[PDB]
Structure formats: structure tokens, C-alpha cells
């Protein structure tokens, strides 16, 4: 099976790219695995595969760190993400996002059922399960527990049986058979939890699959619409069905080649302390746990030589910045197009720590509307900031089509020189606010409301008669003849390549 | 004379450092010299010395591009700036700014007069001067003329004869005997021009000195206090006197080892079209000239084998960001400390395009003040935005003492995660605004007023009880024992040094 359809194939693809380190020396899942992974993420190095995890018993488990973090080589920067999606390792961030959006406007390719698969090679059931005895990583020294769940897919189905949601949400070991995990509004796992609560179901059938087909974990991190099952979306991206096997102890379906599956229930009543956790914005608050829902684990099934993927998230650059903001950006672009706004492209610049999205404006179309930045910024915010796909994003930066939104430097240049502070901004005090951002939960105003802005970084004339400047840069301030004469003589004269 | 006291010694210092390319092939000062210089600045390469400029006659002139731009080696990034100031090429940005501020707390060392110097080796006088015939560079294809003046020092003296100002302001060739150049409020060349206008002088004695002592060009770019002669401040930085020679045709004094000096007058009545120009924010507006004062040149004196320095400014990274923003940040730091604010450090992050200054707060001292972000942000903006040193800066970012303000990434992380948009900002509509920024002159509100902000990127607890988080990074989320084990294993395991 190809790398995009098998986590095991994906690991072999990273090994063939020279993008993986096999660590055969013993590594402690108590901080050491996470510390190596963190330094890989901070230096854009090769993905670490921990083949010798201290305390690993009965084939549980190896750990892969930094599954979707960046490569240092500029030409292959997004290569680990491209290997999730059958793209070449030289794929741009735009190629990745265009691919994830491609299933927006084709029929779903429905999953197919198989009677067994590698995920059924081993099992532990009922009283034999002790999650406290498994080598679950301590991901940050001040975390409130061992975060087993940083890169698995939660599988949960609506009461009408029509909607099977796949999503990533963190969870830590809580007890011998229990996890505690974030189940927050407006995420689909919480929307589905509340539907079961409302009809009186105490224990909701649930599964958590680790080392899923790479296309599936990408869809799990994407805010595709309410009531759309990720399985068919994934099939449409991959151009063929995901093969699913039924769980042994409930009626849910998991990918047949998953590394590890937990089967059990999500409670609508039982709560337990969850966190703290070193989260996507780069912060942990020692001692600050909050009640979260309890997951009960009734069976574990796993592959021989099982691998648990691990995101050691925090400061730049890990899966929380390469997947969460970027895939929200892709969905915000599509919402803006839906609403008839002249947006061609969107990206979440890494410098914004997954709180910023830059929206590229088709300025020809914009001039036909005969509007102004003040009116346009308000309309963009009113569309985006009252939708789930805009929940985590606190600053939208509107830029003209001379700016590459995929280049942090271009976006920051437009922001700093085209958006007059206060004057060119529209502030949103009444929309849902992402409480995980420190300036929200640990700030000066309501933790769950407001703190958003649309920054108009189009110059005044872009709305009326058009661009009337030239960049003072090599590309735009010198004629083609002069540029070519320089580039042809560059190395001969003594400059670097 | 050492490198920091002689431009010619400084050029040889860059050559000794392997930081200089001698281009002995013919290079056209019409766009080709600037195009090479611009690509050097965009790639942080070696400074280009054009030894064979097409149209050079009688020793006028060679050109040095990118005299104070960045090196590519991260340990010597600021080495070209350090060689202006008798600092090692490994000097930090903090070392450079501390050296430039060192003269504000010690008595000036007054310049010494010499009867002659290398700048008197050659002369062109009166009717023999034809500036349109000199190899003045065309710096950007859409500029309104040949900007001869991008890295020279204007010398102008007050009516009472006691204050001699040295500053950098652009000027272009206007005619056979004239330049036109920016003389804008609140700059000292404009304050002194207005002193002369008020007593009815039409033509003010003036000189422009190119390839001055590198310490002198750094002070020329720095907003030292009103009425302080830069000569004595430069002496104090260097710890010895600048040697000055009198001009032949007026009573002004210029560095005796300058490469090239123009002697003449600055008009108080006559203006000529000036610009457009590819300016510090990265923009040229083709066809958009504005009236500026006329300089008349009556004599040229120059060294054998004279070198004209040239700044091909625009997009990152050239002299306008390495010197203008950083030296303003230095003066803003000193202003904050004189106002009694707990500011330890300040820098102008390159991503702000010399419009942002980050201010590092002593949070132990802040807590002793018992204040809050709203009150403190307003006080900082009131102190800074009502002073000349704050004029070019539109955004101040206040950060706690865990942020390295010299590191653009740490500043952006603090700004993105610790400053609630709107809520944590104080906007300034009534202060002077820097019209050259496109969102000012080409924006939605008054070109010369407002458009400023202080962003409070201190979390709420920093003002009261103290830092209550840990960064989710390698340095802060893992114990020293774990960090040491990982660092000691790193290369053996197969990761990059
Ligand atoms: C906010 C999140 C995390 C955190 O910062 O603690 C935590 C970190 C980890 C586990 C590493 C993490 C990774 C590595 C990735 C790649 C994504 C997330 C997370 N975690 C969180 C979480 O615990 N809760 C949550 O609300 N969303 C999270 N997402 C994002 C969601 O997956 C995304 O919003 C989906 O679109 C949701 O699917 P639908 O509801 O639309 O079907
Ligand atoms: C704003 C400026 C420029 C521009 O962007 O066009 C232009 C570009 C060049 C020449 C390359 C340039 C360089 C390479 C450097 C290093 C500095 C400047 C400039 N130019 C300008 C200009 O034309 N007018 C201006 O008002 N200030 C300028 N400074 C900054 C001043 O030197 C500084 O503000 C001093 O502090 C002023 O001294 P005092 O008055 O305090 O004594
Ligand atoms: K393997
Ligand atoms: K239902
Ligand atoms: K999803
Ligand atoms: K604008
Ligand atoms: K020389
Ligand atoms: K000066
Ligand atoms: K704040
Ligand atoms: Mn969903
Ligand atoms: Mn001055």
C-alpha cells in the first residue's frame, strides 16, 4: 500500500527520503522522547523513530516523533506533509492545501469494509488493560499527565448513524482504563457528544486510532463541514476507498492498517482533571488542570511492531502550526468564495503561531465592487469570525495579489507598511474567542468572547484605480536585461550561488 | 588611522575580513551597480567595491555598495556595522547600540583641526563642476534622478555658529551645479534651515562629505539630542578626536580623510522637483516627484582613487533598516529610562521594516510600580510618540524579560500570543506620523498625523504576581539533565550539529 494509505508505508517513505532517524539506543518516554522530538521541530531536522522505548512490553510500542513537521532543505520544506498526500517532496504549501480542498467539489469515495487487517494482529481486553503501565510519553515536564493522544484520530458517530466524525483532540492517561481529553465547542466531537447527552446516552461508542493512513490524519485535522463524514472526503482526496475494519467491542469502523486502536466509550456525565498541556501557542501553565470528559478503554488492538505517533507541540515548528492553522486557512478561503468575497488564496503564517490568516485579494474583482477597506474588512470578519472554521483565528490580514500569502516575509512586509494601525483595522468584541490563547484565558477581558481583528493591508488605491507603486527590490526595480547580466556574472564576480 | 576613523581603512578591513568583493570589470552606474548591491542586500552577501565605474574620470569615482548591510554567517551577522565602531565582527546588535549610546553619559571629545588631509588631494571648482557628467548611480529604475547622496553626511551649522549638525538625508543630481534632497521636519537639517530662514539668509553654507569616518556616519544616522554637535559625540564614542579640515570656499569643517566633499549652499527659498525614490519601507511611486530644497555645489575636493559609498535601499536588508530603525530604538530605550520607565533594551525588528520597536521590560521593577497594561501602554506612547526619536516609529511592542527583543521570532511570538488585538493596544491619533510610510501618505487618513499604537504584549500576571507559565520549548519544558543527555547524544544518533 502507498505511503498516503498506510502509516507503516509512510515511515518507510521517510526512511527512503533520508528524512528519518532510527534510534535503537533506549529512550525514556518520560520526557526524553519528547525532548528529542521538540529539538527536531525547533531545528527542522529528520523525524525520530524511537525503536527502543524504555518500558515497552508485549509489542507496545515504538514512537514516531514530528510526523508532519518541516524539513530544513528549502526546496523540500513541506516534504513530510507531501508524503501524507501522494505529492512530490518539493510540493508547495499551496499544492498541499489545494489537494486537501480538492474533495470539496467531487463526490465522496465511500470506505470499503474488510473482515480483518494488520490492526487485528494483537489485543488486550477488559481487566488486562493498564494504561498507566504502557509507555505513554510525558511530552512536557509540567503536563498534568502522560499525553498518549497527540496524533491519533477519534472516531465518533451521531445518534442517527449518518455522520461518523474523525478528528484530532488531545487526551492523557487518567487511570487504569480511562483517558481525559479536550472535548470543546465548537469541535465536532463536542457537537456529537452534546447530541448523545440530549437523548440521555451515558456512554457513547468511541474509538481512537493511532498511525492511521496519513491522508486520514490530515482530514482529521481539517474543519470540513458539519455532518460530512471524513472517511468519504479522505477517499476523494486519495482517489480510492479507505479500507475499514469493524471494532471488536462496538459497531464503529477504524482503518484496517492502523498501528493501535483503543475501543470503548466517551462519557456524557463522567469528568476528570485534564491538563495542563504544552499547547499549540507555545505555553503550559503548571498546576492548571480543568475538568474534561472521561474516555473508557475496553479493548486495545494493534499491529506487530506497533508505532505510536507523537506531536511534541509548542513553539515553532510542529504539527499544530503545519496542520491546524494552515487547514483552517484553506477552509476560510473556501467560505470567503462561498460568500462571494474576492479571496483567491489563504495561509496561516508561522510567525502568527496559528492565530493569523493572510487572505489574498483578487484586486481586479475588488475594484469592480467600488468599496473601501473599512467596509470590506467589516464584511470579511462578519463572515469568517461567526463560523467554526474561523474560531481559532484572531487576526485576518487582507493583502493584494502582489503578495505571496505562503511567504511569511511578504505578509509581514504588507502588514507593517500597508495597514495603518487602528485606522485600517476592524475589531470584533462580540464573536467567539479562542480561550486557549494566553491573551484570552490569562488576559484582560472575557476569555471566550472577542479579541479579534481584520487588518486591511491593501493600500487605498488598490480599491479604486489600482496599484501605483513598484517594490524597491531586485525583482521589480531593475529591468530584465540588467537582472540577467547580474545573475549570469554573480558567481564569476565572487558572490555565493 | 583605524577602520572606525577612516573610510579607506574600513574598506581594507572588510577586504581583510573576506567581506568585500573587488569588481575590476566595467560596471555601469546606470542601474547595474545598484542591481548588484540590491541582490547583495537581499542575500546578505559580501559588500561590492566597484573599482571600474563606467564614466569615471580623474579619480571620480569608485563605488562601495551595501556599506552597513548584514553578513550571512549568523555569528558575524552585524560584522560590517561592528567594523564602523571598533567592535569585533561577532558583536551583538546590543553591543552596537550600547556603543552608540555610550557618548550620552560622558563629556564630548571635541574635534581637532588639521591644516590639510587626503580629501584635499584633488579639486574641481565653480564652472568646471558638471554634476550631470559624474558617474552618479541610478539606484532604482523608477527614481526621479541619480541619487549621488545615499550614504554621505550633510554638514550644516546654526546661525550663532555653536551647533554643527551631521546627518544623512537623500539627494539627487538636479542640474549642472545643483542637488535636490529631503529636508523634512523634525530633522535637525530642517530645524537649522528654518533658523537661517527666520533671520533672512537665502543660501546657508553647507558641505556634504562622502566616505567619512565610519563612526561619524553612524552618528549621522542617529537622532542624538537637539543642539548637540555630532563631532564631539563621535569623539566620545571613538575615545579620541575626529581630525577636521576647513572647507576651501566656506567656514565649515569636514573630516580630513573624507573620500569626496561637496562645498556650497542649501537654499531657504528655492525648491526643485525631488524623487521619487526607492525608500526605506521598500516602495517607489513612479512619476511622483515633490518639491525639495536646492543645494548648490561651488567646489568638489576628493582623495586620489575616491570611493562614493551607496545604499541601494528598499526591501530587507540594507542600511535604512540596519541603521535608521536600530539607532532610533537605541534613543527610544534611553528616552524610556530617562522618563523612569522600566525598559532594559529596545530593538527595531527587521520584519517591521523600521516602523516597529520592541521594548523589553524589567518585570521585577514593573511589579514594584503596581500598574496595569492599559495605563502603562498609554504612558509609554505619551513619552515616546511626543519626541523626535519616536517620529519614524508607528508601533511599540512591550514584552517581558523572557523575550529576546533582538530576535524577530521571539518578538512576533510574544506579539501574536500576549497582545489581545484592540483590547491590549492604545492607539495615538494626535501625534506626528511619518508620511513616507505608504499607509500614511497613500492611506485613508491624515498623511502627517496619527496612525500609531502601543501593543501591550505583557500577560496580565506580569503586572501583579509574576510569570505563571513555562514555554513549551526545548530550553524551558525539559530539565537540564534531559537537555544535556539529548545534546550529548545528538550527532551520534544521526541529527545535524
Ligand atoms: C487545540 C488542540 C490542541 C492543543 O493545542 O492542546 C491539541 C494538540 C494536538 C493534540 C497536538 C493537536 C494536533 C497535533 C492537531 C494536528 C490538531 C489539533 C490538536 N489538538 C487540539 C485539541 O485537543 N482540541 C481541538 O479542539 N483541536 C485540536 N486540534 C485541531 C483539530 O483537530 C481541528 O480543529 C479539526 O478540524 C477538528 O475536527 P472537526 O471537529 O472539524 O471534525
Ligand atoms: C528617511 C530617509 C530616507 C528615505 O527613506 O528615503 C533616506 C534614505 C537614505 C539616504 C538611504 C538614508 C540612510 C542610508 C540612512 C542611514 C538614514 C537616512 C536616510 N535617508 C533619510 C532622508 O532622506 N531623510 C531623513 O529625514 N532621514 C533619513 N535618514 C535618517 C536620518 O539620517 C536620521 O533620522 C538621523 O537621525 C537624522 O539626524 P539628525 O537630524 O537627528 O541630526
Ligand atoms: K518500520
Ligand atoms: K442525530
Ligand atoms: K476533521
Ligand atoms: K490599508
Ligand atoms: K581600496
Ligand atoms: K545625526
Ligand atoms: K497583554
Ligand atoms: Mn468533522
Ligand atoms: Mn543632530
Residue numbers in the entry:
A (entry chain B), B (entry chain A): 14 to 510
The authors write:
The final step in the pathway consists of the decarboxylation of 3-methylcrotonic acid, catalysed by an evolved ferulic acid decarboxylase (Fdc) enzyme. Herein, we report on discovery and optimization through directed evolution of Fdc decarboxylation activity with 3-methylcrotonic acid to produce isobutene. Recently, a reversible 1,3-dipolar cycloaddition mechanism was conclusively shown to underpin catalysis in Aspergillus niger Fdc (AnFdc).
The effects of crotonic and 2-butynoic acid on TaFdcV were studied to determine whether the mutations that increase in 3-methylcrotonic acid turnover also affected activity with related compounds. Incubation of TaFdcV with 2-butynoic and crotonic acid led to the familiar split of the 380 nm prFMN peak in the UV–Vis spectrum, similar to 3-methylcrotonic acid. However, as previously observed with pentenoic and hexenoic acid, the spectrum did not recover the following desalting, suggesting that a covalent inhibitory adduct is formed. No decarboxylation of the Int1 with 2-butynoic acid was detected, even in 1-month-old crystals.
